[PDB]
């Protein structure tokens, strides 16, 4: 049978035009009185999956 796509990763990962994976920062839910404005202003941006993590999660999102 054709292998299945990780549905929990397809809801929060995104493929760029060079094959890389793009994500969002993960410390922005509810404790905004404990983080400075410099932190908050930079955690609302996006980031890239590092090389170490990419090698472990290639096959989970192969078909988008």
């Amino acid at each position: 049978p054709k292998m299945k796509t990780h549905r929990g990763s397809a809801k929060r990962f995104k493929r760029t035009g060079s094959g890389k994976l793009k994500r969002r920062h993960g410390f922005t839910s509810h404790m905004f009185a404990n983080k400075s404005q410099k932190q908050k202003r930079k955690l609302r941006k996006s980031a890239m999956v590092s090389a170490g993590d990419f090698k472990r999660i290639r096959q989970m999102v192969a078909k988008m």
């Binding site: 990780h6 990763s9 809801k11 929060r12 993960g26 999956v49 472990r56 999660i57 096959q59 989970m60």
Partner: protein, 145 residues
């Protein structure tokens, strides 16, 4: 010549068989090491497992939604349209007639990458602002279908 068949060199290789003696380097343990979870038959962990540490996908948030009414257009640039003859009435039927456009998903949109020299009369559903301007600079005429 059925007795002198010679396949192309490098196109075929002999497979590797493990567990067939210690003179080949893949003997006793067959390339597996010594006494772990990965040395057992059917052993191994999930694709994204990290041994109890929270997986990467579970410490970043989800984002967005999917639009049901999403429109995706078939894209043709200016360079491809230069293959026509002067004065030709360029039509989406003509685009699929030649086979340059395989499927018109929701329509045809002309973008402005490249250059156009022929004076054409193109028709489609959508035009980019630069593409429409460029065609009008060569004595063209764009009418939106």
């Amino acid at each position: 010549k059925l007795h002198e068949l010679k396949p192309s060199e490098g196109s075929r290789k002999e497979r590797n068989r493990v567990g067939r003696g210690t003179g080949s380097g893949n003997g006793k343990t067959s390339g597996r090491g010594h006494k772990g979870q990965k040395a057992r038959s059917g052993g191994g962990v999930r694709l994204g497992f990290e041994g109890g540490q929270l997986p990467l996908f579970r410490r970043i948030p989800k984002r967005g939604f999917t639009n049901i009414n999403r429109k995706e257009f078939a894209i043709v640039n200016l360079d491809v349209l230069n293959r026509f003859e002067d004065g030709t009435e360029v039509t989406p039927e003509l685009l699929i007639e030649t086979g340059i456009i395989r499927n018109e998903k929701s329509g045809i949109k002309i973008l402005s990458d490249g250059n156009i020299e022929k004076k054409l009369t193109v028709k489609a559903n959508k035009f980019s602002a630069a593409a429409k301007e460029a065609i009008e600079a060569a004595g063209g005429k764009t009418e939106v279908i």
